[PDB]
Amino acid sequence: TGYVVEPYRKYPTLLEVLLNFLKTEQNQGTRREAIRVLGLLGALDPYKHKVNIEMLVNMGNLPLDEFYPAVSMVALMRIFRDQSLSHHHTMVVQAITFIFKSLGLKCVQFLPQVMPTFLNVIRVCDGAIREFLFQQLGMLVSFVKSHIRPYMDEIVTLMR
Amino acid sequence: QLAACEATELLPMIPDLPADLFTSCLTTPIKIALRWFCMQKCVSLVPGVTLDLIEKIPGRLNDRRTPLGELNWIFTAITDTIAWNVLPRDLFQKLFRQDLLVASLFRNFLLAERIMRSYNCTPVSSPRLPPTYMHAMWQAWDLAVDICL
Amino acid sequence: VGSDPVILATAGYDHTVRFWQAHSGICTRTVQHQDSQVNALEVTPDRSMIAAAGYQHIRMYDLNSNNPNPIISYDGVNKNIASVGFHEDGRWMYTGGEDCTARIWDLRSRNLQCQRIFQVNAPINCVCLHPNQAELIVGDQSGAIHIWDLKTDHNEQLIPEPEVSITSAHIDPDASYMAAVNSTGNCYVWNLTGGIGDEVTQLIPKTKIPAHTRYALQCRFSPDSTLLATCSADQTCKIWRTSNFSLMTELSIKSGNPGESSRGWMWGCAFSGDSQYIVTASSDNLARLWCVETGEIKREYGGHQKAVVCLAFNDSV
Amino acid sequence: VMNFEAVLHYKHQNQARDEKKKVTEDLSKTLLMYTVPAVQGFFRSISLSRGNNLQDTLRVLTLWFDYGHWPDVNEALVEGVKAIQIDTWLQVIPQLIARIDTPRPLVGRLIHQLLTDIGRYHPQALIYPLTVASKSTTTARHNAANKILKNMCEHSNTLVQQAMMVSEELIRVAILWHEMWHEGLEEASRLYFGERNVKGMFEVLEPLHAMMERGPQTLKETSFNQAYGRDLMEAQEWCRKYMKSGNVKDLTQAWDLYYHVFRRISKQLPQLTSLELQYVSPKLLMCRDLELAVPGTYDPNQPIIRIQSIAPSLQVITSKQRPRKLTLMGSNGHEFVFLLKGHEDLRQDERVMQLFGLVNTLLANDPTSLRKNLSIQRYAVIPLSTNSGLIGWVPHCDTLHALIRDYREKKKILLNIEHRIMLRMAPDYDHLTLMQKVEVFEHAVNNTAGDDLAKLLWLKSPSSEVWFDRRTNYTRSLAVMSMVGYILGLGDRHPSNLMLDRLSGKILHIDFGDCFEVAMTREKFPEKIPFRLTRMLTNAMEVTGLDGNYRITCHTVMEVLREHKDSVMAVLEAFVYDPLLNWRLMDTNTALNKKAIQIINRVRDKLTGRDFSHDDTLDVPTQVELLIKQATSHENLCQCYIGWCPFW
Amino acid sequence: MGPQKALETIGANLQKQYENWQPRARYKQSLDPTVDEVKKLCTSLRRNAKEERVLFHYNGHGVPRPTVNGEVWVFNKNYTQYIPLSIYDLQTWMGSPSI
Amino acid sequence: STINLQKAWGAARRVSKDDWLEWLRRLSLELLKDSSSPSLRSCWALAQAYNPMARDLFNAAFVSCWSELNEDQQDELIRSIELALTSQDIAEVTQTLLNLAEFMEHSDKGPLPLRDDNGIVLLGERAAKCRAYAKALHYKELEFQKGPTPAILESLISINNKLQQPEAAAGVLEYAMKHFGELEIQATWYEKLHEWEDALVAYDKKMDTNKDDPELMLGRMRCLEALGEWGQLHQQCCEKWTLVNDETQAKMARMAAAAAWGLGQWDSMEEYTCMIPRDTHDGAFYRAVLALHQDLFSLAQQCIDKARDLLDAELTAMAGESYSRAYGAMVSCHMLSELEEVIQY
């Protein structure tokens, strides 16, 4: 049909979505095809791209003692979102629980990152896992103590 | 001696109470007594009473014939009663009658013992009082306040 | 202090005025100048007392008498006093302001006011006095050498190079050549049509000397008028000879080292009576003394704790 | 524009013949042939930009305003004004409101008829401009503005009576009674002890006594009046007993109580760090869901983000002028933040921001420059009176002064090392000649290194290809606001009045209070610079130096400014032939129309390279070079005020 | 309020609250006090009241929690360090009729 | 804590892509086990089972280790890093060590003690190999900071031009003209500046005086194709083949194929294309192009599709930092998928 460059206006995210496939998908027909696509849509003047449109300085911000937990927490939570967790839920949550156990009450700073995803995981996931997640939720609860109060509604909804 | 909390326990961090909780009980009883009334499930049956209304209760703590003074006057009667029906006579005299300020503190301390309970604290006193939190004259106060606001 | 035929004095940012001696360099005595620094000194022309052009205030200390604080205080100049001069008889002092106003100050009669003024555009750097005591030469920070007649009230402006702050000036005791020196690093020589009885007072442009790379800061002729010494901000004091205008001598206080990030500039110089020794001041605490023939450091007057800007050097009987 | 340039040939070429009865009528014959087809034409090029016509629209104004007192330009203007989309004029309202009081009869009535139309459609857009016009001093403004607000009340009374109240409450918050008393008293003490002036000292104080005669309107004013309303009443009594007797023995009793509250209030203001809005202004706390839009948000092509509710308490920045950090929950939900300033006329800022609007337009339409992201970082400014206004706060920014301070303390560098070197060498640094001070300046440059900005611009970037873009943008940006800054003539650019975007890297100037060489002529520390291109900022560019990105970006900019000089004049003539700003230039000595014409002479000069040498015509590379030399010369830099920070 | 205003004010309010229950007493409030400050204060109140009862209200939300050693926390002159204060020392300075 | 680490440090007896990557994998995981911080130790368990967990913590993991280790142990490690960069340019081992090296500069820990400069010269080389031009410039300027030379400036104007930053290149030239007023060997400089006519003058002069060199010709050929001149470039190829080596002929033949293709001389093109190595993108491309003139689509389609699979790495190295640099590779795939449309046309 000859629908070219125009797709970078209409559904403009497209370039970011395609250039992940070249840096992820382990097939030299899929990685092969993703090039056939990019080509056929054509190249963009990077100014046209900037119209159509952390991790290192994550060290830069902090002293090192606080750095390490923050990095791990970010990597863990980047997995902690459906597709990769289909196998590796349990692993992630075992790490987190060990992190908070290790930190003391300085763990509290990570709460708003973890907790919203965490509770949504419980509702979403299969019952194969679910009895484990509650064991570990209760573990988070214990280290954090009273600071969990903001999320308590959601927890009670989950339990109920 | 008078002490906010037991040796184990930590004081409450609860956003709507003051951080001064044991002092405020001891020396502004009516002000927290009313605010603490408002935070219970008791208020389910006093509709149209918010914390804003309790800010502006008219009267003062000396003019007996004005809602604030009335509650204050009641309060005094109640705490003095809870002490006189609980403590042995010698001890009651020592604390509640000998001198003004101590008597005022221990009267009010009874209120603290009742409140701070509901937030996992227990106050402590050097002449050790018995537990008065359950004593039925409190449920009189509860009604008295209810009507009076 | 007064008794020595070579009175040398020196000062800058250390608040002291130190009195050296020529042969040895044992410090005779020192005097305080608090509240300020010293922009330039001069001795009065009968060796009687010495001037210290401060910020807001000239003061004058006794050279003959032993250990005083100032005899005379003049204020009434609401910025720096950037130069002085003196009437060779010893009645007047011809000052220059940072406030664009080259005054006259009577020495004998006490009067806190000035006798005359000569207002121009920019701040007044140099105030040098022509030998017959009738003309006064005032430069400034916009190129402009104004020649001001003290008798007739005439003022004839004169721009050698556009805009560049002409930093200092002097005219020889012969009245044959005048030299003023600018911030570009050029020393401009002017031929005198010597206006004695006529007031012709015309100048004929002789030579632009590529004198220095950086700021030239003070130029002076010797009493011989064979030699024109030009101090600078390349830590140098290049002596020029009168006939050619060729580099006869090049004094330098450079390091002799690939890394020495400005030891300090070569501020002000002043010849001897015979013009064989040339003193100089510097911004590394060292008032020196040289040999004009060769360029050999005959003495070194190191006593100041902070920097030094101005000299006061004196041959006369 | 051929017809417009032909018009300006026989205007300017005739004043050459004329100045240096019937020569104005022959002119009025010759001009009129072209003046009218210029106007007719522009209307078609405005109706075929429709989204990009600020340049074109300002051309129509230059014509209307100046050659509209003819009836035959009036005719074509009238016709076009009825034809053109009423959207278009929104972009040029400041120019229109500035001439709302025209002594020309026929022009002024057409303006009204246009503003009353913009008042009909897009009312939001107008009311804040009109409200500051409304409470003017001069008669033909405040009659005509209050007139249009009356004619604009029966479209939208609900809208105006909101917006007018909001406005008048925001000003009660912007300065509190005890501030007004503190600044009033300190100025009063300068008059009677410095100058010895007594009648002018009453002129200072008694408008505050007239303020306090109204009585406590809000809780904080109640607590002023209860704390010290009495003292001030009594000091007023004694200063009024001076006006019948004329003894200094009255006055000593008054200055007792005046210094009394002065010292008390001076001991209070350091701790007023945040203002609980109930105490200061209850109407705004009470305010929920105004139809009136969030200030400096209104777009004719967007739906209105309206004031859902004002935030309950205000953070107070500590400076000379103690600005508030006011914030509004808009009806889209989002906290919008402002900064609400007392004692500064922000109509300069308003117009200057309009100018950058023009420049960004010009630079974006040259394709060579478009590519390069030459874009001035303009924020929003909404005046509320002559004495106050709001200013759109900027996200992801920090003053150089803050960056450098944070870096210096991180790596344990003593903050004022440069100033301390200078003082350790020469203790009397202020009290030196020029040449002496150049010594000391150079010494303290040649012992530190100015890597500080250059270094932290890399430490704070994540990756290198980020850092690269940051620094490329940083340079070009800093050049564009050199050249634009120069023209405007934008004084006092010390390191707390400019700031770095911690994302894009771009620079962003703030505070346009010192404009058109106000700073160049002040009688203590007159600036000698065009723009700060100090060594620190220099080191942060590519290691080669100025000769790449920065110098080449100056030419690129200055080709574009010297090209379209007439657009740039139209915009600047606004706040020059508006009387109510230009008192700023009357204060240069220790009359106005002459002084106002001096500015616009000056700016015509910078845009013709007839700036340095009135006789010569300095072509663009050459003009730029002389400027760079000026800005970077150590004589010029060490004359600057010590807190200007020239050794950064 | 900003720190210093708040602390002074709280001393005023706390005094006003005790004035209801006892309006005829000397109320000597100490605000973020040093050890030596407290010593001067308690001993001074002894010599005034001399045989009769003396209140000692101690708040301590600013300081860390009191130790098993029998030490309660106050400040040093510069406000860097929480200094401790032995209860034994405190009941030395305060008299026997006390609360 | 280090005896298990030592197995993954200098196990650098590696030769193919898979061999070096598997060095990297095992290294990153070996780091995570050790790392003294409990909040990384934790992840190891996961880091095996999901490898991008180790990938992303690599830099962080590395500092947690490196912070502890002995001086002997630091040099032991660094010597295998030196060797990992030096021996074998793998996109995803260089771009993980360069990004580790850059991570190390923002740190309190100091930069990596490589080869006495803090490795500036080494790391800059290998950024310019990767087409990591921005990083390449950071280090190139770090050289400049310790006393510049004509060689530094020469490169520094090409690299600025490779970032498409010509005002900065022109600036660097105006540094040169002040301080190195004589040194001015600008035959390569004009060529790097994108002053292609003046470069052709300077290489005309330099090939008149000195002999028929291959290097002067390669530059003077690059001048012609950058001008556009096809007729003249086909002359500069024809004459010099036996005088030229076979190593230079791999560099040369790419320009030659485009030139002969320029002039509709296909027989010549066929000869030159074979000289280009098949495992490169370019070789695959021109083979495919010849095939399209000849009319052999099966073969062509295979070569196209082979080229894509080789291009994978060029698009996988660039775009990991910025799309702007990816843009080079983007034009190639544009051509390829258009190459496909040539068949269909």
Ligand SMILES: Nc1ncnc2c1ncn2[C@@H]1O[C@H](COP(=O)(O)OP(=O)(O)OP(=O)(O)O)[C@@H](O)[C@H]1O
């Ligand atoms: N538009 C803005 N965006 C972000 N920050 C701003 C803005 N305007 C001002 N600020 C910040 O607030 C501070 C004070 O602002 P400003 O300089 O306008 O107030 P001021 O009291 O006039 O200060 P000064 O005494 O320097 O004139 C500045 O140092 C700046 O960091």
Ligand SMILES: [Mg+2]
């Ligand atoms: Mg400011």
Ligand SMILES: [Mg+2]
């Ligand atoms: Mg300001």
